[PDB]
Amino acid sequence: ERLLDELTLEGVARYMQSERCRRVICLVGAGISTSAGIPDFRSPSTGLYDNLEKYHLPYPEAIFEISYFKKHPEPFFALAKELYPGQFKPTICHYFMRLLKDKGLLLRCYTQNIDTLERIAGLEQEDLVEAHGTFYTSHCVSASCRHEYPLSWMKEKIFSEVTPKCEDCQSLVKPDIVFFGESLPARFFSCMQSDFLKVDLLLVMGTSLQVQPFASLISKAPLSTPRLLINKEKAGQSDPFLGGGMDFDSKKAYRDVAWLGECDQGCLALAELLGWKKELEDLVRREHASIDAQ
Numbered sequence: 001e002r003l004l005d006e007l008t009l010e011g012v013a014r015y016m017q018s019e020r021c022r023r024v025i026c027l028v029g030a031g032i033s034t035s036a037g038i039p040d041f042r043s044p045s046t047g048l049y050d051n052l053e054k055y056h057l058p059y060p061e062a063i064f065e066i067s068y069f070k071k072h073p074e075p076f077f078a079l080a081k082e083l084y085p086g087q088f089k090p091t092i093c094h095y096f097m098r099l100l101k102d103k104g105l106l107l108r109c110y111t112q113n114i115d116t117l118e119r120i121a122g123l124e125q126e127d128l129v130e131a132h133g134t135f136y137t138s139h140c141v142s143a144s145c146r147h148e149y150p151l152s153w154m155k156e157k158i159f160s161e162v163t164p165k166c167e168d169c170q171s172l173v174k175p176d177i178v179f180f181g182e183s184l185p186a187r188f189f190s191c192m193q194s195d196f197l198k199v200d201l202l203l204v205m206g207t208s209l210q211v212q213p214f215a216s217l218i219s220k221a222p223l224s225t226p227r228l229l230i231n232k233e234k235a236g237q238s239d240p241f242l243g244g245g246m247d248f249d250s251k252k253a254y255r256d257v258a259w260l261g262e263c264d265q266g267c268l269a270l271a272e273l274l275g276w277k278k279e280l281e282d283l284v285r286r287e288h289a290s291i292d293a294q
Protein backbone atom coordinates (compact mmCIF):
# COMPACT_ATOMS: atom_id res chain seq x y z
CA GLU A 1 0.00 0.00 0.00
CA ARG A 2 1.75 3.06 1.43
CA LEU A 3 4.49 1.79 3.74
CA LEU A 4 5.64 5.17 5.10
CA ASP A 5 3.71 7.08 7.75
CA GLU A 6 4.81 10.33 6.18
CA LEU A 7 6.77 11.24 3.09
CA THR A 8 9.73 12.69 4.98
CA LEU A 9 13.09 11.63 6.39
CA GLU A 10 11.37 10.93 9.71
CA GLY A 11 8.95 8.65 7.88
CA VAL A 12 11.90 6.81 6.31
CA ALA A 13 13.78 6.53 9.62
CA ARG A 14 10.76 4.95 11.37
CA TYR A 15 10.28 2.60 8.44
CA MET A 16 13.94 1.60 8.52
CA GLN A 17 13.91 0.52 12.16
CA SER A 18 10.76 -1.54 11.55
CA GLU A 19 9.96 -5.17 10.79
CA ARG A 20 9.47 -4.68 7.09
CA CYS A 21 12.86 -3.04 6.35
CA ARG A 22 15.49 -5.76 6.02
CA ARG A 23 17.16 -5.20 2.62
CA VAL A 24 18.43 -1.84 1.36
CA ILE A 25 19.85 -1.01 -2.07
CA CYS A 26 21.89 2.16 -2.65
CA LEU A 27 22.07 3.82 -6.07
CA VAL A 28 24.86 6.38 -5.94
CA GLY A 29 26.69 8.65 -8.30
CA ALA A 30 29.23 11.46 -8.44
CA GLY A 31 27.38 13.66 -5.99
CA ILE A 32 28.53 11.49 -3.08
CA SER A 33 32.18 12.02 -4.00
CA THR A 34 32.30 15.79 -4.69
CA SER A 35 32.91 16.51 -1.03
CA ALA A 36 36.02 14.30 -1.30
CA GLY A 37 37.40 16.56 -4.03
CA ILE A 38 36.38 14.43 -7.02
CA PRO A 39 34.46 16.83 -9.25
CA ASP A 40 30.98 16.33 -10.56
CA PHE A 41 29.98 15.43 -14.11
CA ARG A 42 26.97 17.69 -14.88
CA SER A 43 27.10 20.42 -12.21
CA PRO A 44 27.20 23.78 -14.04
CA SER A 45 30.09 25.21 -12.07
CA THR A 46 32.69 22.55 -11.22
CA GLY A 47 31.28 19.86 -13.50
CA LEU A 48 33.55 17.87 -15.79
CA TYR A 49 31.70 18.90 -18.94
CA ASP A 50 32.26 22.65 -18.50
CA ASN A 51 35.97 21.95 -17.88
CA LEU A 52 36.93 19.84 -20.94
CA GLU A 53 38.24 22.93 -22.78
CA LYS A 54 42.03 22.61 -22.65
CA TYR A 55 41.71 18.95 -23.73
CA HIS A 56 41.73 19.80 -27.43
CA LEU A 57 38.82 17.37 -28.08
CA PRO A 58 36.51 17.21 -31.12
CA TYR A 59 33.67 17.61 -28.60
CA PRO A 60 33.43 17.53 -24.76
CA GLU A 61 31.74 14.14 -24.29
CA ALA A 62 34.26 12.21 -26.38
CA ILE A 63 37.18 11.51 -23.99
CA PHE A 64 35.38 8.55 -22.38
CA GLU A 65 34.74 6.91 -25.78
CA ILE A 66 36.46 3.55 -26.27
CA SER A 67 37.32 3.78 -29.95
CA TYR A 68 38.63 7.31 -29.54
CA PHE A 69 40.60 6.01 -26.56
CA LYS A 70 42.40 3.30 -28.54
CA LYS A 71 42.90 5.83 -31.35
CA HIS A 72 44.33 8.56 -29.07
CA PRO A 73 44.65 7.41 -25.45
CA GLU A 74 46.66 10.48 -24.43
CA PRO A 75 43.93 13.06 -23.61
CA PHE A 76 42.17 10.63 -21.27
CA PHE A 77 45.41 9.81 -19.45
CA ALA A 78 46.14 13.53 -19.27
CA LEU A 79 42.65 14.01 -17.78
CA ALA A 80 43.31 11.26 -15.23
CA LYS A 81 46.57 13.10 -14.50
CA GLU A 82 44.71 16.29 -13.52
CA LEU A 83 41.91 14.51 -11.65
CA TYR A 84 43.86 11.85 -9.77
CA PRO A 85 43.37 12.95 -6.15
CA GLY A 86 46.19 13.16 -3.64
CA GLN A 87 44.47 11.12 -0.94
CA PHE A 88 41.59 8.66 -1.26
CA LYS A 89 39.30 9.67 1.63
CA PRO A 90 35.68 8.46 1.43
CA THR A 91 32.98 10.80 2.66
CA ILE A 92 30.46 10.70 5.50
CA CYS A 93 27.99 9.44 2.93
CA HIS A 94 30.36 6.59 1.99
CA TYR A 95 30.71 5.69 5.65
CA PHE A 96 26.94 5.84 6.04
CA MET A 97 26.73 2.95 3.58
CA ARG A 98 29.44 1.19 5.59
CA LEU A 99 27.16 1.45 8.65
CA LEU A 100 24.35 -0.10 6.62
CA LYS A 101 26.72 -2.93 5.68
CA ASP A 102 27.86 -3.48 9.27
CA LYS A 103 24.26 -3.47 10.56
CA GLY A 104 23.22 -6.17 8.12
CA LEU A 105 20.89 -3.90 6.14
CA LEU A 106 22.85 -3.30 2.93
CA LEU A 107 21.82 -5.73 0.20
CA ARG A 108 23.84 -3.97 -2.49
CA CYS A 109 25.48 -0.69 -3.44
CA TYR A 110 25.01 0.09 -7.12
CA THR A 111 27.50 2.81 -8.01
CA GLN A 112 28.29 4.76 -11.14
CA ASN A 113 31.54 6.18 -9.69
CA ILE A 114 34.97 4.91 -10.73
CA ASP A 115 36.93 6.34 -7.77
CA THR A 116 36.88 3.16 -5.55
CA LEU A 117 35.77 5.08 -2.47
CA GLU A 118 33.10 2.48 -1.68
CA ARG A 119 35.91 -0.06 -1.23
CA ILE A 120 38.14 2.12 0.92
CA ALA A 121 35.16 2.82 3.20
CA GLY A 122 34.94 -0.93 3.53
CA LEU A 123 32.33 -2.15 1.11
CA GLU A 124 33.50 -5.45 -0.32
CA GLN A 125 33.16 -6.64 -3.89
CA GLU A 126 30.19 -8.82 -2.88
CA ASP A 127 28.43 -5.64 -1.73
CA LEU A 128 29.17 -3.59 -4.85
CA VAL A 129 28.01 -3.37 -8.42
CA GLU A 130 30.53 -1.04 -10.04
CA ALA A 131 28.13 -0.31 -12.90
CA HIS A 132 30.70 1.77 -14.85
CA GLY A 133 33.70 -0.32 -13.87
CA THR A 134 36.51 0.79 -11.63
CA PHE A 135 39.91 2.46 -11.57
CA TYR A 136 41.08 -0.09 -8.98
CA THR A 137 42.41 -2.56 -11.53
CA SER A 138 43.66 -2.27 -15.10
CA HIS A 139 43.91 -4.79 -17.90
CA CYS A 140 45.89 -5.00 -21.08
CA VAL A 141 43.41 -4.39 -23.92
CA SER A 142 44.41 -7.39 -26.06
CA ALA A 143 42.64 -10.75 -25.56
CA SER A 144 45.52 -13.13 -26.05
CA CYS A 145 46.88 -11.12 -23.13
CA ARG A 146 44.53 -9.79 -20.51
CA HIS A 147 47.17 -9.26 -17.83
CA GLU A 148 45.71 -7.49 -14.77
CA TYR A 149 47.63 -4.54 -13.30
CA PRO A 150 46.93 -2.91 -9.93
CA LEU A 151 46.23 0.75 -9.36
CA SER A 152 49.72 1.32 -7.92
CA TRP A 153 51.28 0.43 -11.27
CA MET A 154 48.67 2.37 -13.30
CA LYS A 155 49.37 5.40 -11.08
CA GLU A 156 53.16 5.55 -11.64
CA LYS A 157 52.44 6.11 -15.28
CA ILE A 158 49.78 8.85 -15.64
CA PHE A 159 51.98 10.79 -13.24
CA SER A 160 55.21 9.74 -14.85
CA GLU A 161 53.13 10.90 -17.87
CA VAL A 162 53.99 7.64 -19.66
CA THR A 163 51.18 5.95 -21.58
CA PRO A 164 50.75 2.53 -19.91
CA LYS A 165 51.69 -0.39 -22.13
CA CYS A 166 51.49 -4.07 -21.24
CA GLU A 167 54.74 -5.60 -20.06
CA ASP A 168 54.10 -9.07 -21.56
CA CYS A 169 52.87 -7.92 -24.95
CA GLN A 170 53.29 -4.25 -25.89
CA SER A 171 49.55 -3.40 -25.99
CA LEU A 172 47.71 -0.53 -24.33
CA VAL A 173 46.54 -1.16 -20.78
CA LYS A 174 43.26 0.46 -19.74
CA PRO A 175 41.76 1.03 -16.28
CA ASP A 176 38.87 -1.38 -15.70
CA ILE A 177 36.41 1.48 -16.21
CA VAL A 178 33.59 1.18 -18.73
CA PHE A 179 34.11 3.73 -21.51
CA PHE A 180 31.25 4.85 -23.71
CA GLY A 181 30.97 2.31 -26.49
CA GLU A 182 31.50 -0.57 -24.05
CA SER A 183 28.97 -2.87 -22.47
CA LEU A 184 28.28 -2.86 -18.75
CA PRO A 185 29.69 -5.83 -16.80
CA ALA A 186 27.68 -9.03 -16.76
CA ARG A 187 27.53 -8.81 -12.96
CA PHE A 188 25.32 -5.73 -13.28
CA PHE A 189 22.59 -7.64 -15.13
CA SER A 190 22.87 -10.74 -12.96
CA CYS A 191 22.49 -8.73 -9.73
CA MET A 192 19.68 -6.55 -11.05
CA GLN A 193 17.49 -9.51 -11.97
CA SER A 194 17.73 -10.81 -8.44
CA ASP A 195 18.30 -7.83 -6.12
CA PHE A 196 15.16 -5.93 -7.03
CA LEU A 197 12.82 -8.79 -6.16
CA LYS A 198 13.89 -8.46 -2.52
CA VAL A 199 14.41 -4.81 -1.83
CA ASP A 200 12.55 -3.03 0.99
CA LEU A 201 14.07 0.44 0.57
CA LEU A 202 15.80 2.26 -2.29
CA LEU A 203 18.34 4.93 -1.32
CA VAL A 204 19.41 7.19 -4.22
CA MET A 205 22.21 9.68 -3.66
CA GLY A 206 24.26 12.16 -5.63
CA THR A 207 23.07 11.08 -9.05
CA SER A 208 21.04 12.96 -11.65
CA LEU A 209 19.44 9.74 -12.93
CA GLN A 210 20.02 10.62 -16.57
CA VAL A 211 22.40 7.94 -17.87
CA GLN A 212 20.89 4.55 -18.72
CA PRO A 213 20.44 1.71 -18.09
CA PHE A 214 21.46 2.83 -14.58
CA ALA A 215 18.59 5.31 -14.18
CA SER A 216 15.99 2.64 -14.87
CA LEU A 217 16.98 0.62 -11.79
CA ILE A 218 14.60 2.73 -9.67
CA SER A 219 11.68 1.24 -11.60
CA LYS A 220 12.91 -2.34 -11.09
CA ALA A 221 11.77 -2.29 -7.45
CA PRO A 222 8.24 -3.34 -6.46
CA LEU A 223 5.77 -0.45 -6.45
CA SER A 224 5.52 -0.57 -2.66
CA THR A 225 9.28 -0.15 -2.01
CA PRO A 226 9.85 3.32 -0.49
CA ARG A 227 12.47 5.31 -2.37
CA LEU A 228 14.45 8.11 -0.69
CA LEU A 229 16.51 10.54 -2.77
CA ILE A 230 19.35 12.47 -1.15
CA ASN A 231 20.63 15.02 -3.63
CA LYS A 232 20.99 18.73 -3.88
CA GLU A 233 18.31 18.78 -6.61
CA LYS A 234 15.35 16.60 -7.44
CA ALA A 235 15.94 13.90 -10.08
CA GLY A 236 14.26 10.90 -11.65
CA GLN A 237 10.88 12.49 -12.33
CA SER A 238 9.34 11.50 -15.67
CA ASP A 239 9.85 13.97 -18.49
CA PRO A 240 6.38 15.40 -19.31
CA PHE A 241 6.98 14.68 -23.02
CA LEU A 242 7.82 10.96 -22.73
CA GLY A 243 4.52 9.13 -23.24
CA GLY A 244 7.86 4.65 -13.36
CA GLY A 245 9.88 7.68 -12.37
CA MET A 246 9.97 9.43 -9.06
CA ASP A 247 6.85 11.14 -7.81
CA PHE A 248 7.57 13.33 -4.77
CA ASP A 249 4.89 15.98 -5.16
CA SER A 250 1.77 14.97 -7.12
CA LYS A 251 -1.35 14.00 -5.23
CA LYS A 252 -0.52 10.46 -6.33
CA ALA A 253 2.77 10.57 -4.36
CA TYR A 254 2.95 7.70 -1.83
CA ARG A 255 6.50 6.34 -1.43
CA ASP A 256 9.09 8.78 -2.81
CA VAL A 257 10.84 11.30 -0.56
CA ALA A 258 13.27 14.00 -1.62
CA TRP A 259 15.72 15.36 0.91
CA LEU A 260 17.47 18.25 -0.83
CA GLY A 261 20.94 19.26 0.31
CA GLU A 262 24.43 17.86 0.76
CA CYS A 263 24.67 14.07 0.71
CA ASP A 264 26.94 14.30 3.76
CA GLN A 265 24.31 16.34 5.59
CA GLY A 266 21.38 14.17 4.51
CA CYS A 267 23.24 11.11 5.79
CA LEU A 268 24.07 12.86 9.04
CA ALA A 269 20.40 13.73 9.55
CA LEU A 270 19.17 10.27 8.64
CA ALA A 271 21.76 8.68 10.96
CA GLU A 272 20.75 11.04 13.78
CA LEU A 273 17.08 10.04 13.58
CA LEU A 274 18.32 6.45 13.63
CA GLY A 275 20.46 6.68 16.77
CA TRP A 276 23.67 6.24 14.70
CA LYS A 277 24.98 9.82 14.81
CA LYS A 278 27.80 9.21 17.30
CA GLU A 279 28.54 5.77 15.86
CA LEU A 280 28.87 7.42 12.44
CA GLU A 281 30.92 10.37 13.69
CA ASP A 282 33.28 7.95 15.46
CA LEU A 283 33.69 5.77 12.39
CA VAL A 284 34.51 8.59 9.97
CA ARG A 285 36.87 10.20 12.47
CA ARG A 286 38.57 6.87 13.20
CA GLU A 287 39.00 6.10 9.50
CA HIS A 288 40.06 9.55 8.33
CA ALA A 289 42.68 9.45 11.06
CA SER A 290 43.89 6.03 9.99
CA ILE A 291 44.16 7.32 6.45
CA ASP A 292 45.95 10.53 7.50
CA ALA A 293 48.71 8.30 8.96
CA GLN A 294 49.91 6.91 5.66
Ligand SMILES: CCCCCCCCCCCCCC(=O)O[C@@H]1[C@H](O)[C@@H](COP(=O)(O)OP(=O)(O)OC[C@H]2O[C@@H](n3cnc4c(N)ncnc43)[C@H](O)[C@@H]2O)O[C@@H]1O
Binds near residue numbers: 029178206211262
Ligand atom coordinates in the same frame (compact mmCIF):
# COMPACT_ATOMS: atom_id res chain seq x y z
C1 LIG B 1 40.49 7.30 -9.57
C2 LIG B 1 40.89 8.54 -10.35
C3 LIG B 1 39.68 9.24 -10.93
C4 LIG B 1 40.10 10.22 -12.08
C5 LIG B 1 39.73 9.67 -13.49
C6 LIG B 1 38.38 10.29 -14.04
C7 LIG B 1 37.90 9.56 -15.27
C8 LIG B 1 36.37 9.28 -15.11
C9 LIG B 1 35.81 8.57 -16.36
C10 LIG B 1 34.36 8.04 -16.10
C11 LIG B 1 33.93 7.09 -17.28
C12 LIG B 1 32.75 6.15 -16.80
C13 LIG B 1 31.46 6.40 -17.66
C14 LIG B 1 30.89 7.81 -17.23
O1 LIG B 1 31.45 8.79 -17.53
O2 LIG B 1 29.68 7.93 -16.45
C15 LIG B 1 29.55 9.24 -15.80
C16 LIG B 1 28.89 9.11 -14.67
O3 LIG B 1 29.24 7.82 -13.99
C17 LIG B 1 27.44 9.02 -15.22
C18 LIG B 1 26.50 9.14 -14.22
O4 LIG B 1 26.40 10.49 -13.84
P1 LIG B 1 26.13 10.90 -12.30
O5 LIG B 1 26.83 10.03 -11.31
O6 LIG B 1 24.66 10.97 -12.03
O7 LIG B 1 26.85 12.37 -12.12
P2 LIG B 1 25.95 13.71 -12.44
O8 LIG B 1 26.94 14.88 -12.54
O9 LIG B 1 25.13 13.50 -13.69
O10 LIG B 1 24.93 13.94 -11.16
C19 LIG B 1 25.46 14.62 -10.05
C20 LIG B 1 24.26 14.80 -9.09
O11 LIG B 1 24.66 14.85 -7.85
C21 LIG B 1 24.31 16.31 -7.30
N1 LIG B 1 25.34 16.59 -6.38
C22 LIG B 1 26.58 16.90 -6.71
N2 LIG B 1 27.26 17.05 -5.56
C23 LIG B 1 26.44 16.80 -4.54
C24 LIG B 1 26.63 16.81 -3.18
N3 LIG B 1 27.83 17.12 -2.40
N4 LIG B 1 25.63 16.52 -2.37
C25 LIG B 1 24.39 16.22 -2.89
N5 LIG B 1 24.20 16.22 -4.21
C26 LIG B 1 25.24 16.51 -5.04
C27 LIG B 1 24.33 17.08 -8.40
O12 LIG B 1 23.50 18.32 -8.17
C28 LIG B 1 23.66 16.20 -9.42
O13 LIG B 1 22.31 16.13 -9.25
O14 LIG B 1 27.42 10.21 -16.26
C29 LIG B 1 28.62 10.21 -16.77
O15 LIG B 1 28.58 9.65 -18.00
Ligand SMILES: [Zn+2]
Binds near residue numbers: 166168171
Ligand atom coordinates in the same frame (compact mmCIF):
# COMPACT_ATOMS: atom_id res chain seq x y z
ZN1 LIG C 1 49.26 -7.80 -22.78
